[PDB]
Design a protein around this nucleic acid. Structure first.
Lengths: 212, 86, 79, 61, 81
RNA sequence: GUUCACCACGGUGUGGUUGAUGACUGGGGUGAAGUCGUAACAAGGUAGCCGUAGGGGAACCUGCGGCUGGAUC
RNA sequence: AAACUGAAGAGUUUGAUCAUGGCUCAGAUUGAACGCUGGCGGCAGGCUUAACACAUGCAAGUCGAGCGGUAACAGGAGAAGCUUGCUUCUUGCUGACGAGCGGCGGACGGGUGAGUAAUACUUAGGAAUCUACCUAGUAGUGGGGGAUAGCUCGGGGAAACUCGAAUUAAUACCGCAUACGACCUACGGGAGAAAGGGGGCUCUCGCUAUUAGAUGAGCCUAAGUCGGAUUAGCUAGAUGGUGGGGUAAAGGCCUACCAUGGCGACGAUCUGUAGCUGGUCUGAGAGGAUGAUCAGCCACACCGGGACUGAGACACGGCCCGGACUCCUACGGGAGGCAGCAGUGGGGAAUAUUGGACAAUGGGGGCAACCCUGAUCCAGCCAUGCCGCGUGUGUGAAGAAGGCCUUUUGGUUGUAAAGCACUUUAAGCAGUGAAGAAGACUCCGUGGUUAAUACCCACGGACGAUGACAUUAGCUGCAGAAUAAGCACCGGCUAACUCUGUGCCAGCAGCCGCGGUAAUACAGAGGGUGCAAGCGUUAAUCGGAAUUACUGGGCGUAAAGGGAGCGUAGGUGGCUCGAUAAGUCAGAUGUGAAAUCCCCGGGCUUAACCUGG
């Protein structure tokens, strides 16, 4: 499954911007909220707890990447099984997801549209070494070093990708991705680093939530 | 028996078993001769009965009525006990 | 083959001795070793050794209902 | 054994075939089981709306 | 007798056979004497589809093992390359 | 075939172990606008408690020995 | 290079405190059930209870190239009633083939866990054995006889079947003759086999005796292996020996005699429970719990007992006897055993189709052709689990209406909706379309064989006979947001709060507790929180619990030092010089099945899954 309902109340509950809307206009005027979380009460008494902080951070990351609890707990399990920092590996996996990669490469205005673009078999992927693209419809496909992403020839002239590109131009393009707009192609040259990802997501909170 | 072959194996078993039981009984009587001769403590009679028990013992052992090991064991042991009779 | 060494605790059978084979066994949980002994009946064809001697036995084929070890070396006698 | 009929209202009577699960009632001595509502012959709660699956109440349409 | 045959593994509709030396009377996937290779029916052109220890295969042949018609042709098409 | 030997079923007698029930009876617990007292906690109004014996509707009391986990001294 | 990474606490005893200590909770897991809800796919799993009883179909056949043959079948040759193109009768002549004699198989594969606390299992070894088919050898396969099933003749029986006379074949059976090995030997000598069939004198399939392998099986030893002492003594073929028997083989396995032994607090005996293991779950680990699916071992086959045949059985779909139960009967007698696959009744909270094919991997038979295979490969049903995907995506404010709250005018539902602009994954419709197949047969060539250019064997080419799944996987089009969201919770632990109704009632509750007329705890509504095709509850295991503490706790007063001592077994134990190397440490070697776990890779669009090291 995936979240379908209104997106701005997610950011309102998180207290920050989750990039759930295209950057066509500032987040402040897009909602005139985010000073208070959704619902009747919002700003409340009886201050939050350590568990509340940990849960809110985990839900922040989950809602950023559109990933549900079972998938995200498998992500954490693999991240803790892999050599290195657990939170760093979890962020690396969530950023190596195919829908997030096409979002960051700019073919979708938002991550949900990028996911719906991948799922509808409009995005082709060429694994490093393989001399052939394949049409994939699995948004949670991880990309290795050197994987190439392309747009299906049937849908290269899309009136939504043609502004997702110009919006990505105004938002900023990561260095670990190489995008050719003329041929509508991208390359995942390397997994992103913790110094490249924003230093406002506290992954220590997630790692301490996932330890009972 | 539930199948034709099971029934055939059953009647075949009966015939084979009668045929082999007759020869098993023959082996047993040629050995009882030598045992009676030994129990009488008569070297001459023991040897004379042993000389007829030999080519029945090791002939039905070749037929399969007894094992070659059983025939060899009875041959050796009866010869030992007979030679023990002076 | 396999050779064990132990004292003769019984000899009152004909061509037969019981041998006390000591062994150290480590407790699986508490780690300490406990002295454990098994009585092994051995074959004493010539009825040589008496009770209290330290002898060596070796494994062989069964000789009796409970005898499958045979005396191979009397190393020390009682005092 | 003695079992508790939870919810407001029930149709149980003598010779009623019921399903019984674990779980003791704190303030009832000697009652260590609960009757499953909506299982075999114990009807669900009539106008239940919130926790309907805990009382065997079908989804109102 | 002793046979050299294939024990099926893999999954549904995606077989992967193991070349095993086994007593003939045992179950196809049951107890065996020695595992001396494998076979991928479905495989890619850049991947090992057949591996089989020739020294142990020859040892078991001289020893008495009888290959099946599948492993025999597998060796037939694996030694000609 | 007969007969003997071995032996399964089955039978007989006498016990053992154990489950469920049993008139009645013992203590244990739970339950409230009960009855009788007031034994313990303060020196609890005779310091208490322990072992033991006797006695008593009942908490208990009394003797002997012990302890302080006893006020006051 | 790597396998080397792992550890949280909270509530509740008090007016309050610290400690002790129990109870409860947050986690993970499941062959799960139930309640509400439910779109799809991949891969797994699916009677845990009655080893209850079983209707019905199938689960073990095959060989005519061992044999007599001809019941059916299909041809072929002639008799041709010819009825002129109707058409029949003789013939095993041929393909073949029912029943029958014969061989091989049926001891495998499949099921179950009742029994079993040790004729079990695990680990490590041993010697006194047998072993069909297979591999490599060795010596042979000579010559006769008497039968007999089917087929006849005559009965008996309701059936199941049966009785007698006559009688033919064989690779059925039995003498005789030889015997490299093999067996017995007193070592001088004695005795012991077989069978033929097939293709053009040869080769081949066989048969006999045997050797060495391999495989399998049997036997033995040591160690490990649940609870109870409110079970302490137990054993008389018992423990050992000799002669004899018995076995394929050691052995009280059996027997006669001789001796008085054997086992036991290091737990015998008696009892309760239980298949054991690799593993599985939990745990930081140590431990604790457990032994479904997959694999190894064991035991069992309606109940008890006995054996036969055979290389192998004391035989799941074999025999005999006895028993209980069900059935048939003409009342005299007979038949049967789903713990094989489906399936029925029943029990249960609860567990599936009376499906397809031997195409693939295997297994049985056959020279092959081919036949059999409920193993297996597939398909069906089920959210039972794991994994994946979807139920749209952007933009959209005087922030519409309606619901809810409110200080009555604002907030909130909320960019949420509507309106616009798009997209079509999965589902549907239409196409195309791999791989699973190993290339049978036939033809040619080469080499071996041979008297041979035959036959046969092997090798090398050409050829395309072979797919249950299957309307395959995948791929490409069409259509249109259309076909797709529920469940639990919201006092605290524990993320999320207000109205209305109720008034210690109705009810809730894991714990603490809540409910008395202004309940954030009941019930309903808004709003929210967490999960999501699932979500809760119950059951169950470990965890948290350092709450049996080995790692890793305590005993003055919280529970806890025996009234005190002497002492048996046991545990522990001074200094110095030597020996030994059992413990200990290190190294080598063999083993510790595979699967699983972990690490590095590889293949499914990803993942689950599969897989190499």
């Amino acid at each position: 499954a995936r979240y379908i309902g209104p997106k701005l109340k997610l950011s309102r509950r998180e207290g920050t911007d989750l990039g759930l809307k295209s950057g066509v206009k500032p987040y402040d005027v897009k909602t005139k909220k985010a000073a208070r979380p959704p619902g009747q009460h919002g700003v409340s008494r009886n201050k939050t707890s350590e568990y509340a902080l940990q849960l809110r951070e985990k839900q922040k990351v989950k809602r950023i990447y559109g990933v549900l609890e079972r998938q995200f707990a498998n992500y954490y399990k693999e991240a803790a099984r892999k050599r290195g920092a657990t939170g760093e590996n979890l962020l690396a996996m969530l950023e190596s997801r195919l829908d997030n990669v096409v979002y960051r490469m700019g073919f979708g205005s938002t991550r949900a549209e990028a996911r719906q673009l991948v799922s509808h078999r409009t995005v082709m992927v060429k694994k490093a070494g393989r001399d052939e693209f394949v049409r994939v419809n699995i948004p949670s496909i991880q990309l290795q070093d050197g994987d190439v992403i392309a747009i299906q020839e049937k849908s290269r002239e899309q009136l939504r990708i043609k502004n997702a590109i110009e919006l990505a131009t105004q938002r900023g393009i990561p260095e670990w991705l190489d995008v050719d707009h003329s041929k509508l192609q991208g390359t995942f040259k390397k997994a992103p680093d913790r110094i490249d990802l924003p230093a406002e997501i506290n992954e220590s909170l997630i790692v301490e939530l996932y330890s009972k | 028996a539930n199948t034709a072959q099971a029934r055939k194996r059953a009647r075949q078993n009966t015939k084979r078993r009668q045929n082999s039981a007759s020869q098993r009984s023959m082996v047993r009587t040629y050995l009882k001769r030598v045992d009676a001769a030994i129990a009488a403590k008569d070297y001459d009679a023991a040897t004379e009965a042993y000389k007829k028990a030999i080519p029945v013992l090791d002939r039905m052992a070749d037929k399969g009525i007894i094992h070659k090991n059983k025939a060899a064991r009875r041959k050796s042991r009866l010869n030992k006990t007979i030679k023990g009779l002076q | 083959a396999s050779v064990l060494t132990g004292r003769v605790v019984s000899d009152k059978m004909d061509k037969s001795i019981t041998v006390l084979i000591e062994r150290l066994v480590r407790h699986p949980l508490y780690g300490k070793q406990l002295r454990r002994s098994t009585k092994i009946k051995a074959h004493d064809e010539n009825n040589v050794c008496q009770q209290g001697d330290l002898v060596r036995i070796k494994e062989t084929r069964p000789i009796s209902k409970t005898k499958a070890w045979t005396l191979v070396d009397v190393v020390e006698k009682v005092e | 054994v003695s079992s508790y009929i939870g919810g407001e209202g029930h149709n149980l009577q003598e010779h009623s075939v019921v399903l019984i699960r674990g779980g003791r009632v704190k303030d009832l001595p000697g009652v260590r089981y609960h009757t499953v509502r909506g299982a075999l012959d114990c009807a669900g709660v009539k106008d239940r709306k919130q926790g309907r699956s805990k009382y065997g109440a079908k989804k109102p349409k | 007798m002793v046979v050299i045959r294939l024990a099926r593994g893999g999954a549904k509709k995606r077989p992967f056979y193991q070349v095993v030396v086994a007593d003939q009377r045992r179950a196809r996937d049951g107890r065996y004497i020695e595992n001396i290779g494998f076979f991928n029916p479905l495989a890619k052109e850049s991947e090992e589809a057949v591996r089989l220890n020739m020294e142990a295969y020859h040892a078991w042949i001289a020893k008495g093992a009888q290959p099946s018609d599948r492993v025999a042709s597998l060796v037939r098409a694996y030694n000609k390359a």
